[PDB]
Amino acid sequence: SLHMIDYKEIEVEEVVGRGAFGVVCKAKWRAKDVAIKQIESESERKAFIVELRQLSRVNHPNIVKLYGACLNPVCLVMEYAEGGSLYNVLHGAEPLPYYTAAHAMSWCLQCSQGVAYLHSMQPKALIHRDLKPPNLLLVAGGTVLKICDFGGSAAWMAPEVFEGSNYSEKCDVFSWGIILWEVITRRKPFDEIGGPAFRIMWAVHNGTRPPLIKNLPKPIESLMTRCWSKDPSQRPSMEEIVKIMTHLMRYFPGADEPLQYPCQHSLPPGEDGRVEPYVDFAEFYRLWSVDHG
Numbered sequence: 001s002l003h004m005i006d007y008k009e010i011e012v013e014e015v016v017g018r019g020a021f022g023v024v025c026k027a028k029w030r031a032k033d034v035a036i037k038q039i040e041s042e043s044e045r046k047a048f049i050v051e052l053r054q055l056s057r058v059n060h061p062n063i064v065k066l067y068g069a070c071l072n073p074v075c076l077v078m079e080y081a082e083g084g085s086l087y088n089v090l091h092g093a094e095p096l097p098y099y100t101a102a103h104a105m106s107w108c109l110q111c112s113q114g115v116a117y118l119h120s121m122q123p124k125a126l127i128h129r130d131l132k133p134p135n136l137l138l139v140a141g142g143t144v145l146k147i148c149d150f151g152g153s154a155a156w157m158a159p160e161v162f163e164g165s166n167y168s169e170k171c172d173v174f175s176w177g178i179i180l181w182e183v184i185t186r187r188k189p190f191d192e193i194g195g196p197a198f199r200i201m202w203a204v205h206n207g208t209r210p211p212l213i214k215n216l217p218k219p220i221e222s223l224m225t226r227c228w229s230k231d232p233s234q235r236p237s238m239e240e241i242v243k244i245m246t247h248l249m250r251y252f253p254g255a256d257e258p259l260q261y262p263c264q265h266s267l268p269p270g271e272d273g274r275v276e277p278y279v280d281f282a283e284f285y286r287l288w289s290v291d292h293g
């Protein structure tokens with residue numbers, strides 16, 4: 001499973017942040033870039049063991065990779081993802097990068113691929129339960145996406161979850177839908193509602209959904225809204241999402257192009273309950289017409 005590491009071989013460089021527990025630092029080990037998560041209190045010891053067990057089973061290109069661990073002190077050593085979070089790319093600090101409809105779709109494809117892996121694990125499936133752009137890392141010039149979990153999430157939370165229902169892996173599907181909307185519009189979902197989280201939960205529980213997107217292709221709108229549905233059983237599985245997104249990528253070439261051009265990005269307030277997309281689908285419609293007569 002894992003490869004044990006001695007803590008003296010870890011050159012700790014800089015602290016990245018603190019999630020639910022522990023602390024994440026950038027570091028170097030045997031002359032490779034690594035991100036480490038180290039324990040801080042004895043209180044956290046069991047939480048690490050759980051996470052260490054989960055990560056030792058997981059091996060997928062679109063999920064963060066576990067190199068090894070030391071047990072004194074207990075510390076997880078990951079392959080360092082360099083490009084920062086998807087949240088940062090979408091909404092982070094000046095200057096923001098330009099990205100295409102192809103990047104958007106490729107990000108969401110890569111996310112469905114990683115979640116479908118987690119949902120398919122044997123003997124028991126892993127559910128993410130906290131899918132959102134701050135938990136989605138980008139690498140290789142912003143072209144490759146890695147799922148992770150640092151441990152408010154209300155804007156991406158399936159209604160059955162925050163209402164204390166016996167939820168399933170379908171909750172991840174709901175989140176994926178919200179993220180799809182988000183990367184396409186480059187807007188924060190339910191940003192106008194605001195206040196505390198329960199105001200968003202109230203809205204979504206009552207059926208509120210992100211506003212519809214102008215000129216959005218019907219095959220994409222159809223997928224997106226199925227994922228949003230109140231009844232979990234009417235949401236597609238991740239495997240179906242992977243399949244559909246894989247087929248759709250045929251009409252979205254260029255996703256291997258690195259993010260490099262800066263972007264002065266105005267957010268024109270979309271009134272009348274319908275917003276404009278950030279990305280441009282003109283090339284999709286053209287490529288689609290060519291194929292369909």
Ligand SMILES: CCN1CCN(Cc2ccc(NC(=O)c3ccc(C)c(Oc4ccnc5[nH]ccc45)c3)cc2C(F)(F)F)CC1
Binds near residue numbers: 051
């Ligand atoms: C029901 C609870 N769920 C159960 C299953 N859990 C899965 C689960 C659980 C734990 C994790 N662990 C981490 O991300 C995780 C663990 C350790 C570190 C250092 C970390 O941060 C990085 C790793 C690599 N490069 C980086 N660059 C900057 C920071 C960084 C992330 C990752 C997952 C994932 F979803 F990715 F598979 C998610 C929660």
